[PDB]
Amino acid sequence: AQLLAANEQKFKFDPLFLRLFFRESYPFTTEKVYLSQIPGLVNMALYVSPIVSGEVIRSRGGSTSEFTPGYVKPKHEVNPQMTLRRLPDEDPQNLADPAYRRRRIIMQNMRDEELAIAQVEEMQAVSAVLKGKYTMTGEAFDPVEVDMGRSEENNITQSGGTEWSKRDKSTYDPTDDIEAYALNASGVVNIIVFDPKGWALFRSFKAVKEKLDTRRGSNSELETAVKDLGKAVSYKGMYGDVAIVVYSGQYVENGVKKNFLPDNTMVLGNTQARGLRTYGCIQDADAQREGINASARYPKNWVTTGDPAREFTMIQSAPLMLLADPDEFVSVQLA
């Protein structure tokens, strides 16, 4: 059992979703998300006559304001019985210390913990901006469908009508489809991040390959983001006007591993779409009596006396991240 302050990572490397589209964090002192409580977009046009001023403007009463945040509280043991991750030859005598082994093993345990919540949050993000629906579900828990409201024109499919696979691999240009799906996106699209084989049949067209610019032509901080997360986001290059990226991230589930992304999917939208990170109550007596009922995360190291007389690291959170405008992204399944 070590203090709360032993929670230093400086490792925030989420794959460009919770850090770039979903910056809009709202931890609450209350259980649910109350979209009426969030101001979101403000009623933002009307003025008043040059004699007096008008009424009082409020948070404009969101129609649906009741969903259950994913209160996730996992834990692990940091029992000093293992040989640990030994960074090359930094004096294993301190590993021989139970104190250093226990502290850096709580380091390792907790980092596994937040990357676990981060990967489940990224699955929530990919569900969110791929269908507008999120499955708040788990065993011994009712499945609540949390819908931002993704429209039908945001779910139009490439296989409908003519498929890119069922097209000329040399002369056909899918740019026409690119603006066709981008027009009904309530904004400009500046990233065309694909799943791998989706980008494969996208680039199979020649027009794509002599239309794209392999050069840097550094447009924004997206190159810096790729250099940071050189793991699963791949900056293919410029398609001229728009940036071409491929995400091949993978989640390692209970017995097997598989990619986050489905077979062939796309979301057309902006890099500055508004993403909410509403956070529920944290059900920990420590959190309430020290005021961490409204926060992002909560770690603790703590000893059980009695039957499971041991010591554990416990991580608690409650995210219900969504997208403010589901119509911002057009979600297309590809050929």
- Per-residue interface string for the shown chain with other proteins, residues 191-230, x marking contact by CB under 8 A: ----------------------------------------
Helix (H) or strand (E) holding 179: helix 175-183
Map tokens 């494969």 to a residue: 200
Interface positions, 80-99, toward other proteins (CB under 8 A): 98-99
Q: Residue 332: is it exposed, middle or buried by C-beta count within 10 angstroms (0-12/13-18/19+)?
A: buried
Site for other proteins in 1-60 (CB under 8 A): 5
Nearer to other proteins, 97 or 163 (CB): 97
What lies within 8 Å, CB to CB, of 246 at 6+ separation is 193, 194, 195, 196, 199, 233, 234, 236
Which CB, 165 or 288, lies closer to other proteins?
Answer: 288
Residue 86 or 289: the one with the smaller Cβ distance to other proteins is 289
Shortest approach of other proteins to residue 103 CB, angstroms? 9
183 forms part of the interface with other proteins (CB under 8 A): no
In terms of CB distance, is 5 or 51 closer to other proteins?
5
Site size for other proteins, by CB under 8 A? 3
Least spacing, CB of residue 93 vs other proteins, in Å = 9
State how far Cα 97 lies from the chain centre. Answer: 38
Q: What does the alpha-carbon distance between residue 212 and residue 238 come to, in Å, rounded to a whole number? A: 5
What is the smallest separation between the CB atom of 30 and other proteins, expressed in angstroms? 23
Angle at 224 between CA 223 and CA 226, to 5 degrees: 65
Specify the residue, 1 or 188, whose C-beta has the smaller distance to other proteins. Answer: 1
301 strand-pairing partners = 313
Task: Check: CB of residue 330 under 8 Å from CB of residue 309.
Answer: no
Closest approach of other proteins to the CB of residue 99, in Å: 4
**For other proteins, the closer CB: 98 or 230:** 98
Contact letters for other proteins, residues 99-138 (x by CB under 8 A): x---------------------------------------
CB of 298 to other proteins, least distance (A): 17
Strand, helix or coil for residue 267:
strand
Token pair in block for residue 50: 């040059």
Residues 288-317 that bind other proteins (CB under 8 A): none
Smallest separation (angstroms) from other proteins to the CB of 110: 18
- Integer-rounded Cα Rg, in Å, for the chain is 24
- CA–CA gap between residue 243 and residue 245 (Å, rounded): 6
Q: Which residues contact 297 (CB under 8 A, 6 or more apart)?
A: 114, 117, 315, 316, 317
- Name the minimum Å distance from CB 216 to other proteins: 38
- Closer CB to other proteins, 55 or 91, in the complex: 91
Tell me which residues touch other proteins (CB under 8 A): 5, 98-99
